Amino acid sequence: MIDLLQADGNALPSAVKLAYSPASKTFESYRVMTQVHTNDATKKVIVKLADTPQLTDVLNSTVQMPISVSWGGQVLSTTAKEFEAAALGYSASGVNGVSSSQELVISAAPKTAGTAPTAGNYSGVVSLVMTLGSDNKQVEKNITVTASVDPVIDLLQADGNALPSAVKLAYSPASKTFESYRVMTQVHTNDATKKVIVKLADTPQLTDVLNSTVQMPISVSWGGQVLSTTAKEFEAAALGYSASGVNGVSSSQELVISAAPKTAGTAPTAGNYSGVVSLVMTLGSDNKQVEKNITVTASVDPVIDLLQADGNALPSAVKLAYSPASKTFESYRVMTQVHTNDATKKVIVKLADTPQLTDVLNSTVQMPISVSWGGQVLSTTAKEFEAAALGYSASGVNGVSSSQELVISAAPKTAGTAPTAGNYSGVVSLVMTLGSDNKQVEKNITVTASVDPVIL
Ligand SMILES: [Mg+2]
Ligand SMILES: [Mg+2]
Ligand SMILES: [Mg+2]
Ligand SMILES: [Mg+2]
Structure with missing residues (x-):
């Protein structure tokens, strides 16, 4: 053998x-x-x-x-x-x-x-x-x-690094848009001849982290096709694998992740948003998928402004007229509106320091200042204005309150006789806060007044 x-x-x-x-x-x-x-x-x-x-x-x-x-x-x-x-x-x-x-x-x-x-x-x-x-x-x-x-099958950045696990979309408060994330990608595969089938696992949504119901839709495209939960096909010929290649590395394809308010012409509500783009790429007949999860976030910063109802800034100089006939000051009166992008929050209004009309050349005799807003008297301890009561819906533009009166009246200190003669000056510090949010507006109004004994 x-x-x-x-x-x-x-x-x-x-x-x-x-x-x-x-x-x-x-x-x-x-x-x-x-x-x-x-x-x-x-x-x-x-x-x-x-x-x-x-x-x-x-x-x-x-x-x-x-x-x-x-x-x-x-x-x-x-x-x-x-x-x-x-x-x-x-x-x-x-x-x-x-x-x-x-x-x-x-x-x-x-x-x-x-x-x-x-x-x-x-x-x-x-x-x-x-x-x-x-x-x-x-x-x-x-x-x-x-x-x-x-x-x-893998999807990589074109330097060969992994796609990032998280993406921030920058928000412009001017244009009320989010800037799209864009990145150049390549498919890497060991079965280059097969078609690449591309879907999302679920319809991606940018969702208010603190309110489930407040959503903006996310848009995803890859290689010039808008993607959905319904699969889209990319023929191997259409993916630009080089004839001189066999690493099975595609031509560079752009991934774009965008978001926008659900309704055109509107501003996003303040807050922090997130959702997940779950990208799914299948080799045609091989039954193999890669899933790529990208967390998408956006921040809409809380904003609050107080303006005159015509949209001018409040004045940084008020002067109160004196009648000697009635011995009393005429109040400063102005219609104002709160402009905010968080119009469910309570608005907290207070004075930052306590204002006086101080005598100009001796700093002793002082005629302190009453401030009212929205039909409510102000102190250095704050009054709460509920969002319903400011009436943001009741008027005109969204996120602009109905007109609230600002009333500034000085009538010095002790009551029911004439004030002393003299020229006077000082400063009103006004403070508004969007409640729970960490957002403050300060507005300083210089008050001046005259009593002169040379008139009636
Ligand atoms: Mg864009
Ligand atoms: Mg190669
Ligand atoms: Mg009056
Ligand atoms: Mg008396």
Whole structure:
């Protein structure tokens, strides 16, 4: 006889799996120590493959990787090598007819060495043929070789970095728009011929972190198509894989994530917003997806303004007229409006310091100042104005209160006789706060007054 067995004495396996690592994109070689078992230990051993072995994709016959076979430190082919008996080590083994250990090595890699294998399930047969002498006593060991390359698909930035897990959309309070996130992307895949199918897992929404019901719709496009929960197809030809490439890296494709108020012509409400763009990319027939989750956020800063009802700033100089006939000051009166983008919050109004009309050249005799707003008297301790009561809906533009009267009347200190004569000055500090929010408007009004004893 001639036989080829494992060095332990077991029969050669009829099957071999070549483990694939997607990290290195290579197959681990099968190695096994063997011995020739012979009738005749002086005869040469002629070793060949019956056919040139290939791994072939079970699904597609044109995709093939060559198998490489070595035995005894010699690479095998359909051309036979003759092993002289002397360096098979027949006396080393301690068993008659039995060689020393010879390594069998079965490897696979792509025909173009240094490139990555295409996705697929691969099979083929290695047919090891061994003879003696001039002979036709001939052993054939057939070893079914298997390998799997699982479909891989990734979406990367065009510098090869991962897409970010979070994105901020900058808000302009002037144009009342959010600036779109835009990034240049490339598909990386080991199955480049397949169509890429692109969906969102759910309809993305920019949602007020503190109110479920307050939403702005997010728009996502990739490669010049607006995406939805309904899948869109990108043919491999349309994705611009270079003919000179096989890393399966697409042409650069732009991803755009946009948001806008649900209704055109309107301002977003103050607050912090978020939702998740769940991008889903499928290889056509391979049943494999990558999901990319990108958290999208936006901040609409709370804003509060107090203006005259005509939209002018309040004055930074008020003068109160004196009648000596009635011995009393005429009040300053002005219609004002609160302009806000958080028109559910309570508005908190107070005075920052307590105002006086101080005498100009001696800083002693002082005529302190009454301030009223919205039909409510003001102190340095605050009055609460509920949002319903400011009547933001009741009037005209959204987020502008109906007209509230600001009344500033001085009538000095102790009551029911004439004030003392003199020229007077001072400063009203007014403070408005959008409640719970961390937002303050200060408005300083310089008050001046005259009593002159040279008139009636
Ligand atoms: Mg834009
Ligand atoms: Mg390349
Ligand atoms: Mg009056
Ligand atoms: Mg009296």
